[PDB]
Amino acid sequence: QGITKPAIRRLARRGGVKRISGLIYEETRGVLKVFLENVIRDAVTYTEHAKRKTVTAMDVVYALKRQGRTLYGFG
Amino acid sequence: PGTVALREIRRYQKSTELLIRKLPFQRLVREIAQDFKTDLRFQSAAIGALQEASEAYLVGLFEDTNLCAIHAKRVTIMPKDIQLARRIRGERA
């Protein structure tokens, strides 16, 4: 409900897809949530390692650099 | 363009171009941080990085699905198509 149908549609179009299915919405929300969960889990690991209270953008970068080819080539 | 490096302006512009509304994204990260029983906080830059990367990832997924869709008559994209595209081009994350 939070991430809207217009947004999901727009994201799909950005990638060339003209027409999506009804379940595509719920699936894109699921996929987004799981991806975010993964990045977060890694970043939080990173920032608890160094004994800090706030999750730095750098922690998110270290975390993203471990999510397959997501930020491939950055650095 | 005197006291600011053009690179930074490219960056802020790109931030302007995001496709998910920023408030509900914020609330999403919030939700996941609740489910993780996180005692921690996030600096605003981190949320930004999350959103840029997330939209990047989703658009990528859809691009892959588009690239694997070859049909005589145009088709509506369904879950199975995403699955197969992900098998052929690989999981991006």
Add this chain to the structure above:
Amino acid sequence: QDPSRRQIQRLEQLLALYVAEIRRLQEKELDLSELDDPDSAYLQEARLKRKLIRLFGRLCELKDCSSLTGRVIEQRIPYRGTRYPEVNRRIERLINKPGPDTFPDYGDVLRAVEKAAARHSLGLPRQQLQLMAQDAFRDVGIRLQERRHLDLIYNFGCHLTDDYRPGVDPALSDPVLARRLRENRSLAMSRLDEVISKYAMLQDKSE
């Protein structure tokens, strides 16, 4: 040309102050409650970036220059893929259409090829056309994706991330951290696959 000079001086000063405040906001740490707040530092940063870009455009407009910032995603993609120039031109035209959302379907590419071949009246064996169109769509689509991705990684992050070096990852040193990250990664992957499959068998049940 003095009041104009002083005016652009002003607007540039303001541009710099905007930048400084954005830098400030990016550094703010947000509580779980703030992440529900509509006026949180993230959204303040957002609106500030918006009004900054607006000011910038105003300045460009004032300086006889265009509002382009030299983005990679702006760079025209050329296509000389098939040895039929008449098709290459049309495909080029299609992939460089004005817009942020001009990524083509396979259908768009096939239609382009068929249209050009029928117009420039060449021998167009259908299976040959369809193959050529498929290869074109793949080539062109790959390049579009590469461009989006470069545009991502070149304009990614902020001053806080600008110092990233892959070899300073503490996980390389500390084996414990590396182990937790390992288990993490395995969960991550099995979760993504879980969702993709989940909705796959859901569509299966629907049909």
